[PDB]
Each structure stands twice: as structure tokens, then as C-alpha cells.
Amino acid sequence: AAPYAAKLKQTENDLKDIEARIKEKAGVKESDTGLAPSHLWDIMGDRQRLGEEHPLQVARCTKIIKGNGESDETTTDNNNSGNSNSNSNQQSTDADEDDEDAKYVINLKQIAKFVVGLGERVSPTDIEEGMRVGVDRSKYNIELPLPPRIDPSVTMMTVEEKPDVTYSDVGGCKDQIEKLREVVELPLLSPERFATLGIDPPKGILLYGPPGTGKTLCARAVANRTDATFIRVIGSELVQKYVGEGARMVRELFEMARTKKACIIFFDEIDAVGGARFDDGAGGDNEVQRTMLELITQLDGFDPRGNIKVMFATNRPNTLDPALLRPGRIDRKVEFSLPDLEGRANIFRIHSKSMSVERGIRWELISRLCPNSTGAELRSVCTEAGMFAIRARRKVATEKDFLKAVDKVISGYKKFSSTSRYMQYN
Amino acid sequence: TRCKLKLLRMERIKDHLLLEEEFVSNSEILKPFEKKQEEEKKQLEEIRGNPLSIGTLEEIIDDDHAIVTSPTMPDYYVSILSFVDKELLEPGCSVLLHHKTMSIVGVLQDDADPMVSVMKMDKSPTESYSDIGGLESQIQEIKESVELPLTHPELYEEMGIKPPKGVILYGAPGTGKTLLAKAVANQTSATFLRIVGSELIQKYLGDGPRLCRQIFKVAGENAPSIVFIDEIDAIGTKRYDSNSGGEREIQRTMLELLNQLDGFDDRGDVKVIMATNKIETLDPALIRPGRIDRKILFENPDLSTKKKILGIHTSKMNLSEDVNLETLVTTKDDLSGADIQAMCTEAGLLALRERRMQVTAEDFKQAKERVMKNKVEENLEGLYL
Amino acid sequence: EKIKNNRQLPYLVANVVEVMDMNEIEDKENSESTTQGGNVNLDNTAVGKAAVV
Numbered sequence: 001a002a003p004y005a006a007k008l009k010q011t012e013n014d015l016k017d018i019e020a021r022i023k024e025k026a027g028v029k030e031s032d033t034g035l036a037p038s039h040l041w042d043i044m045g046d047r048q049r050l051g052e053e054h055p056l057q058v059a060r061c062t063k064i065i066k067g068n069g070e071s072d073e074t075t076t077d078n079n080n081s082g083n084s085n086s087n088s089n090q091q092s093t094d095a096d097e098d099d100e101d102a103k104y105v106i107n108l109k110q111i112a113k114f115v116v117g118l119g120e121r122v123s124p125t126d127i128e129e130g131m132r133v134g135v136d137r138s139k140y141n142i143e144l145p146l147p148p149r150i151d152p153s154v155t156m157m158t159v160e161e162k163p164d165v166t167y168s169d170v171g172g173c174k175d176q177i178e179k180l181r182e183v184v185e186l187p188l189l190s191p192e193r194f195a196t197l198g199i200d201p202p203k204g205i206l207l208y209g210p211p212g213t214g215k216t217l218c219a220r221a222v223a224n225r226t227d228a229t230f231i232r233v234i235g236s237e238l239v240q241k242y243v244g245e246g247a248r249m250v251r252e253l254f255e256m257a258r259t260k261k262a263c264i265i266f267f268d269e270i271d272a273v274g275g276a277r278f279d280d281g282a283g284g285d286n287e288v289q290r291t292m293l294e295l296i297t298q299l300d301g302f303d304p305r306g307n308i309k310v311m312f313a314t315n316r317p318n319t320l321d322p323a324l325l326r327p328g329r330i331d332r333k334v335e336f337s338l339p340d341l342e343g344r345a346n347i348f349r350i351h352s353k354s355m356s357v358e359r360g361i362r363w364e365l366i367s368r369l370c371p372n373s374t375g376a377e378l379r380s381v382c383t384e385a386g387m388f389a390i391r392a393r394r395k396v397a398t399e400k401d402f403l404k405a406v407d408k409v410i411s412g413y414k415k416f417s418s419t420s421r422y423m424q425y426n
Numbered sequence: 427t428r429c430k431l432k433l434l435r436m437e438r439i440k441d442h443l444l445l446e447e448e449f450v451s452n453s454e455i456l457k458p459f460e461k462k463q464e465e466e467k468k469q470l471e472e473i474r475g476n477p478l479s480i481g482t483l484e485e486i487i488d489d490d491h492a493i494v495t496s497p498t499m500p501d502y503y504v505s506i507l508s509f510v511d512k513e514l515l516e517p518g519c520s521v522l523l524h525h526k527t528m529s530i531v532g533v534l535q536d537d538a539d540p541m542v543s544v545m546k547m548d549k550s551p552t553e554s555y556s557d558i559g560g561l562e563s564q565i566q567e568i569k570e571s572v573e574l575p576l577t578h579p580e581l582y583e584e585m586g587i588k589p590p591k592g593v594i595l596y597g598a599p600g601t602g603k604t605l606l607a608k609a610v611a612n613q614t615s616a617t618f619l620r621i622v623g624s625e626l627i628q629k630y631l632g633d634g635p636r637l638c639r640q641i642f643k644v645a646g647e648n649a650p651s652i653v654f655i656d657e658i659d660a661i662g663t664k665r666y667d668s669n670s671g672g673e674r675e676i677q678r679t680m681l682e683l684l685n686q687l688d689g690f691d692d693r694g695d696v697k698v699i700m701a702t703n704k705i706e707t708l709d710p711a712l713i714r715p716g717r718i719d720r721k722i723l724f725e726n727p728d729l730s731t732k733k734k735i736l737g738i739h740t741s742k743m744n745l746s747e748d749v750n751l752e753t754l755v756t757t758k759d760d761l762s763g764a765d766i767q768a769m770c771t772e773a774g775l776l777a778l779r780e781r782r783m784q785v786t787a788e789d790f791k792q793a794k795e796r797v798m799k800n801k802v803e804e805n806l807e808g809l810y811l
Numbered sequence: 812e813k814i815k816n817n818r819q820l821p822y823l824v825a826n827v828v829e830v831m832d833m834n835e836i837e838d839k840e841n842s843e844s845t846t847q848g849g850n851v852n853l854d855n856t857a858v859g860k861a862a863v864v
């Protein structure tokens with residue numbers, strides 16, 4: 001067996017040599033972290049590290065007490081509460097007087113709750129519910145306030161103001177789009193007519209529908225047309241909710257819009273976060289329920305809204321609270337639905353507009369062959385047709401190139417039922 | 427004999443030299459410098475205590491501090507100081523803390539974690555440029571979507587279209603969907619991520635959404651890349667348990683996956699691959715077309731396709747003069763590509779059974795009847811007859 | 812002054828689950844429900860006035 005046998009052992013030793021080579025290599029890596037502009041940072045670096053001045057634990061207020069009327073002395077007092085401003089200033093049968101207030105009860109991120117004092121930098125106007133506050137390593141007492149929650153900087157990303165979307169980038173001039181105009185623009189221009197009729201002007205809308213219709217494109221479309229600044233929150237992209245973190249997510253952006261005038265508060269994708277609670281379910285959550293309870297009251301409070309409109313897109317109306325579905329929160333309801341022939345013509349024309357293709361194509365001709373469909377599928381026919389076109393080595397996709405692309409999606413539909421029909425001869 | 431010697435001529439001398447070269451150089455690196463860099467290192471070691479508690483950087487506040495969440499139960503406002511920069515850090519990157527008083531003393535990780543280790547692989551692909559025949563067409567559809575933007579982006583720009591993002595391989599077991607993805611990855615010479623979608627899920631709660639983030643985070647650092655999340659079915663619509671101990675975990679984990687795939691941008695530079703048994707083990711909408719192009723349905727080899735698979739196997743085994751290539755096909759009826767490989771393993775065991783060193787006629791014939799018997803139905807021709 | 816030192820901050824936050832109060836001369840001796848001679852006290856050496864927190 002000498003031709004392969006001898007050469008087998010030789011193969012083997014090389015592989016083992018290669019394994020050994022990799023363990024020699026990885027035991028030494030690239031030197032070190034030393035950088036000349038941060039060697040000057042070292043001068044300050046020795047002093048602070050050895051000193052008692054970091055780390056500060058992150059805590060956050062979860063319960064507010066007022067530090068007199070609290071019931072701290074319990075000598076000749078009664079209940080769990082005092083006079084709500086005095087408890088030791090009206091009596092010295094306690095044998096004590098104290099003039100400490102706004103003491104506050106924090107929660108650590110280890111889930112351990114403590115009452116703390118106030119520093120030399122703190123006054124009751126620097127602290128609030130839900131605001132991060134730094135406390136000591138050992139014996140605790142607030143040193144410096146940190147801004148509320150982890151929400152700032154992460155929210156601003158989701159918010160885009162003044163969209164670069166109009167009703168050219170939406171195909172179809174659909175029924176829902178005509179009822180959409182009436183909600184935002186019409187009472188903003190003239191709140192006079194609504195007042196005289198004796199209806200209270202529409203300002204709530206819930207856009208809902210199957211996926212892929214483009215409920216969002218429209219919503220953006222009118223935001224630009226009404227020429228209002230746009231504030232977006234997406235409650236399934238932003239998943240901060242833990243112990244009323246998402247109520248702080250809601251509050252900020254609503255609060256910001258309220259300071260401005262001519263605004264759109266678009267609450268998006270609230271199937272989770274500010275949506276259905278899962279107490280009833282097996283999830284046990286009621287963390288999204290704080291987000292819900294806040295959202296309602298912000299609306300209700302804002303009213304009359306001074307022509308600043310609160311909009312809603314949610315995929316399902318099954319994930320909403322029936323308090324939202326009372327008027328004065330949502331007033332108008334639009335289900336987005338499959339576009340008509342020409343509506344599907346238009347979504348094809350925009351996709352095709354971006355392409356560099358032969359112009360002899362007719363948009364109506366393609367969409368005839370197409371069935372009733374979602375916009376997202378018509379995005380797929382153009383991207384698929386593009387791929388067929390380069391493969392055949394045309395720099396154009398002919399009318400014929402889009403008919404092959406349509407057909408493959410349909411053929412799949414046929415595979416899941418039964419193939420072959422009477423339309424091969426009719 | 428002569429050419430396996432030629433493989434030995436190329437590999438032995440170049441490889442053996444490479445080990446030896448590394449080994450001397452580790453000494454040699456040291457010798458050029460004897461101050462400056464040595465000094466800076468020396469004081470880095472005085473500053474950084476032993477041990478170092480790991481951190482994870484949540485966010486940077488621009489004032490020479492930051493907030494970390496650490497495997498120590500309470501969070502910390504730490505400072506950024508000593509041999510680290512404000513811009514040497516990015517959020518969500520893993521940092522090294524000082525045991526005594528938590529401070530970011532630098533990074534030597536940069537997204538170094540065990541879930542990263544499972545995911546990255548230095549292994550050799552099993553197939554290279556479709557070693558095993560059959561499914562000629564289906565690979566010229568993966569390639570259009572996945573390989574083709576990486577190799578030539580220019581062609582899509584003349585066309586004026588956006589370039590595809592991702593593919594979904596699905597349908598039949600034993601058709602080597604998981605092996606075509608490995609083939610395509612070797613052809614390009616891309617970065618391959620064998621992570622499995624089922625390796626994010628455990629009983630213990632709240633760990634999972636971190637893991638989903640880390641995949642997209644690492645994939646983008648080493649881009650171009652091909653990401654294969656194999657077996658995303660298990661994390662589908664279904665539930666962990668009907669009692670407890672998992673009511674949350676699947677729900678958070680899936681949702682979190684769709685989000686950071688879309689949130690990149692609509693890229694044609696980090697492709698994803700979802701390998702799944704069906705769309706009936708997942709949610710009815712994924713994320714959901716125009717965005718996930720293209721979908722590839724695997725079905726059973728036809729007579730042409732299963733010939734091709736077979737010819738590969740039979741030639742690597744003794745004899746084929748005994749029973750014609752055609753006579754194997756004829757006897758077989760249409761089945762997945764595993765059933766074709768199965769007949770050949772059984773054939774080889776049968777040559778052992780006889781104690782032959784040839785795959786004889788008798789061996790082929792039995793091995794064909796065996797597989798057909800597993801895997802059987804007869805009411806196709808019983809309804810009929 | 813000794814009590815004020817305690818009442819001064821920080822201090823742990825907790826909740827009371829239930830209260831269990833027994834009196835002196837529970838058998839003949841003690842506020843506990845055990846058997847030992849003497850040490851009739853409110854809670855000092857013979858515990859029975861208690862909160863479970």
C-alpha cells in the first residue's frame with residue numbers, strides 16, 4: 001500500500017504542525033494600549049484611582065417622601081404619615097426636631113431600596129422621580145444627579161423632523177389618504193367651522209393594516225404637506241420600558257412637541273411598549289402597562305390641543321387599550337388595504353423611475369399581469385427583474401424582463417395548491 | 427503517486443518554515459526598543475491592578491465619565507481615564523475595569539465574548555464550489571443575490587437598482603441547503619459566521635437580547651461578511667414551555683433579531699442567511715418582502731439532478747463496470763440527495779459483509795432496495811390500482 | 812441620642828409580612844413557646860413580640 005500509506009502519515013504531520021503553529025501565534029498579540037496623548041492623562045490618573053471619588057453606584061428614584069411628615073420619629077406619632085409637612089416641629093414630646101425634607105427613596109440596579117440624604121450640590125429642585133442619581137460605594141447620600149433614564153440620545157435617532165416624503169413617493173390616491181387629509185390639515189387651517197357645527201375637531205387617527213401597504217409612507221407624506229415638524233417614536237424599535245422607563249420615553253417627546261407649535265406626535269408600532277399588557281398572558285408583564293397609563297393621560301391633558309395633532313400607527317387594533325378607542329384619543333380609523341390596478345401601476349412607476357431601463361415600457365401593462373398585491377411585493381418584482389437583467393447582460397430590463405419576474409412569485413402560489421389549469425388554452 | 431508528492435513539496439517546506447519563523451520572531455520583536463514604549467507599558471501595569479473585573483459600556487457621557495453595566499449587580503458611573511481615549515471607545519463595546527475603584531483603563535477586547543467565539547469559525551468549508559453535483563439552478567440564484575454584490579457592485583449601479591440583502595433557504599431535509607451556503611462562502615473568500623440561532627436560547631432569562639445585538643455588531647466590524655444564522659425555526663412563532671421558565675425568552679429574542687437586520691440600512695454588503703425547515707415553523711410575516719430577497723424552495727432531485735449526485739459517489743468507490751450508471755437510476759425512484767448517499771454507504775458495508783475489495787453487482791442491487799423500504803408509500807399506486 | 816444615630820440616614824427599606832405577638836408566662840416562664848426556666852422579658856431574652864419583615 002506504499003503509494004498512499006506513506007503519503008498518508010506525511011499529510012497528517014503537516015496538519016498537526018499547522019495546529020501547533022496557531023497556538024504559538026496567538027500567545028503573543030499586538031502591544032499594548034499605550035498612546036502618547038493618554039500618557040499625560042496618567043498624571044491625574046493615579047490620584048483619582050487611589051482616592052475615594054469613584055465609582056458612584058447608579059441608583060434612580062422610585063418613591064418620593066417628604067422628609068417631614070414622613071413618620072421618621074415614631075415616639076408619640078401615629079400611622080405611617082404625619083401632617084405632610086410637620087411631624088417633629090409641633091411637638092417635642094418626640095424630643096426631637098428636624099428640618100429635613102425631600103429625602104427620597106432610591107432603587108439600585110441590584111434591586112435594593114434605600115433612603116438617602118442630599119449632598120451640597122443637591123436641592124429638592126435638582127431631583128425628581130425617575131431621575132438617575134449617583135450615590136456612594138459605602139454609606140449612601142446623593143452627590144450628583146444624572147439626567148433621567150437611558151432614553152436621551154437613543155430617542156433623537158428615531159425622530160426625524162420635516163420628512164423628505166410627499167404624495168409622490170406613495171402610489172395610489174387612496175380612500176384612506178383622502179380621510180387622512182381631513183384629520184391633520186383641515187382643523188389646523190380653520191378651527192372655526194368645527195366649532196360652529198358643534199363637533200370637536202378630529203385629531204386622533206389610527207393607521208392600521210396588513211404589512212407592506214405603506215401606512216408609514218402616507219403618514220410621513222402629510223407631515224411634510226401640512227408643513228409641520230415631525231416627531232417619531234417607534235415602540236417596537238425602542239424597547240426601553242423597565243419600571244416606567246418607557247413612560248419617560250413617551251413623556252419627553254410629547255413634552256417637547258407641546259413646547260413647540262405646529263407638531264405631529266407620531267406613535268408608531270405600539271403593539272409592544274405602551275400596548276397590550278401580559279398580566280392575562282403567561283408573560284406576566286405590566287411594565288408595558290406603565291407606558292400605556294402615561295400615554296392616555298398625556299392626550300387627555302393636552303386637549304384642546306391648539307392644533308397640534310397626535311397620530312397613531314399600530315399594525316393591529318387588537319393591541320390597544322379600549323381607553324384609546326374612546327373618543328378624544330382616537331377619532332378616525334383607517335384600514336390600509338391592497339391598491340387598485342392603477343394604484344399598483346403607480347408603485348411600479350416609482351420603483352422603475354430609480355432604475356435605468358429602456359423607456360418603451362408601460363406601467364399599466366405590467367400591473368395587469370400582476371394580481372392584487374402589496375407594495376412590498378411590487379418592490380420585489382423590480383429588484384428580481386434587475387437581477388435577471390444583468391445576468392442576461394442587458395443594462396436595461398425590457399418589458400419582457402419584468403414578466404419573467406412577476407411569474408416566479410405566482411408559480412410559488414401554484415406549488416402550494418395544485419398546478420396546471422384550463423387557462424393554457426382559454 | 428507523483429502529484430500527492432507535489433502537494434507535499436509545496437506544503438512541507440513553506441508551512442514548516444512558517445512555524446519556525448514565528449518562534450524566533452517572538453524573541454526578535456523585543457530587541458529593537460529599550461525605552462519609551464517599555465516605560466509606558468511599565469506604568470500601564472502599575473495603574474492596572476490584578477485582577478480586572480469585566481465591564482460592558484452602556485454609554486459615554488462627554489465630560490470624562492461614562493456609565494457601565496457590569497456582571498456586578500449595581501451599575502457604576504465610571505470615569506474614562508488613563509491610556510484610553512473618549513474616541514477609542516464606542517458604545518456597546520466591552521471595556522476593562524479596575525477592581526478597587528471601577529474606571530475604564532482601556533479596551534483589549536472590542537466585542538470579544540464567548541458567543542462571538544462560537545460564531546466566528548476558522549474551519550475549512552466542507553464543499554468548495556459545488557463539489558457534489560445536483561442543484562445547479564438553485565445555486566445560480568443564491569449567487570445572484572449574495573456573491574454577485576460582493577464580487578461586482580458596479581453592475582447594479584448601471585442598472586440603477588438597489589442591491590439585494592439576504593436569502594432564505596427552506597423546504598426539504600437531505601438536499602444540502604446548509605452545504606450550498608458553505609460552498610458560496612468559500613467561492614467568494616468571505617467571512618463566514620456559523621452561528622446557530624438555537625444557541626442564544628437558554629432557561630435563564632434576560633440573557634438573550636444581548637446575543638442578538640452582538641451578532642449584528644461583530645458582522646459589521648469584519649464586513650464584508652456572510653452571516654448564516656442556521657435553524658431560526660426553533661425561535662419562531664412557537665413557545666418554550668406552556669408552564670413557565672421561558673414565556674418571555676422566544677418573544678424578545680425573535681423581535682430583537684428582525685430589528686437590527688433592517689436597522690443597519692438596506693445593505694448589500696452584509697448578507698444574512700436564514701436556514702429554516704419551513705415558514706410554518708416561523709411567524710407568517712417575517713420582515714417581510716422587498717428586503718429579504720430572495721426565497722429559495724428546495725424540493726427533491728429529479729432524474730437529471732439525482733444522476734449528477736450519484737456519479738460523484740460511485741467513482742470514488744471500487745468498480746462501475748459491473749452495473750451501468752443508468753441501471754442505478756432506473757431502479758431508484760425520486761428521493762432527496764441523502765437517500766442517494768445512503769445507498770452508496772450501505773453498498774460499501776455490503777462489500778465488507780462479503781469481504782470483498784470490490785463493490786460487486788450483488789452489493790449495488792441490495793443497497794438500492796434497502797433505502798426504498800424506509801421511506802415508503804404505495805397508496806399512490808393503490809388509489810390508482 | 813443613641814436612637815437618633817440609627818434614625819439618621821441611610822437605612823434599608825423593607826416591608827412587614829406579618830406580626831407575631833406573645834406575652835410573658837406562656838407556659839409558666841418566657842414569652843417564647845419553648846421550655847426553659849425564668850427570663851420573663853418582652854423580647855430581650857424571650858422573644859415573642861416580633862415582626863417578620
Ligand SMILES: Nc1ncnc2c1ncn2[C@@H]1O[C@H](COP(=O)(O)OP(=O)(O)OP(=O)(O)O)[C@@H](O)[C@H]1O
Nearest residue numbers: 169170171211212213214215216347375376379716
Ligand atoms: N405606497 C408606496 N409607494 C411606493 N413603494 C411602496 C409603497 N408602499 C410600499 N412600498 C414599498 O414597500 C417598501 C416597504 O414597505 P413600507 O415601509 O412602505 O410599509 P408599511 O406597511 O408601513 O410597514 P411595517 O410593517 O414594516 O411598519 C417601501 O420601502 C417601498 O419600496
Ligand SMILES: Nc1ncnc2c1ncn2[C@@H]1O[C@H](COP(=O)(O)OP(=O)(O)OP(=O)(O)O)[C@@H](O)[C@H]1O
Nearest residue numbers: 558559560561599600601602603604605763764767
Ligand atoms: N447541490 C448540492 N449541494 C450539496 N450536497 C448536495 C447537493 N445536492 C444534493 N446533495 C446531497 O445531499 C446530501 C444531504 O445533505 P444534508 O444532509 O446536509 O442536508 P440539509 O438539507 O442541509 O439538512 P437538515 O434539515 O438535516 O439540517 C449531501 O450529502 C449530498 O449527498
Ligand SMILES: [Mg+2]
Nearest residue numbers: 214215216217
Ligand atoms: Mg411601517
Ligand SMILES: [Mg+2]
Nearest residue numbers: 603604605701
Ligand atoms: Mg441543514
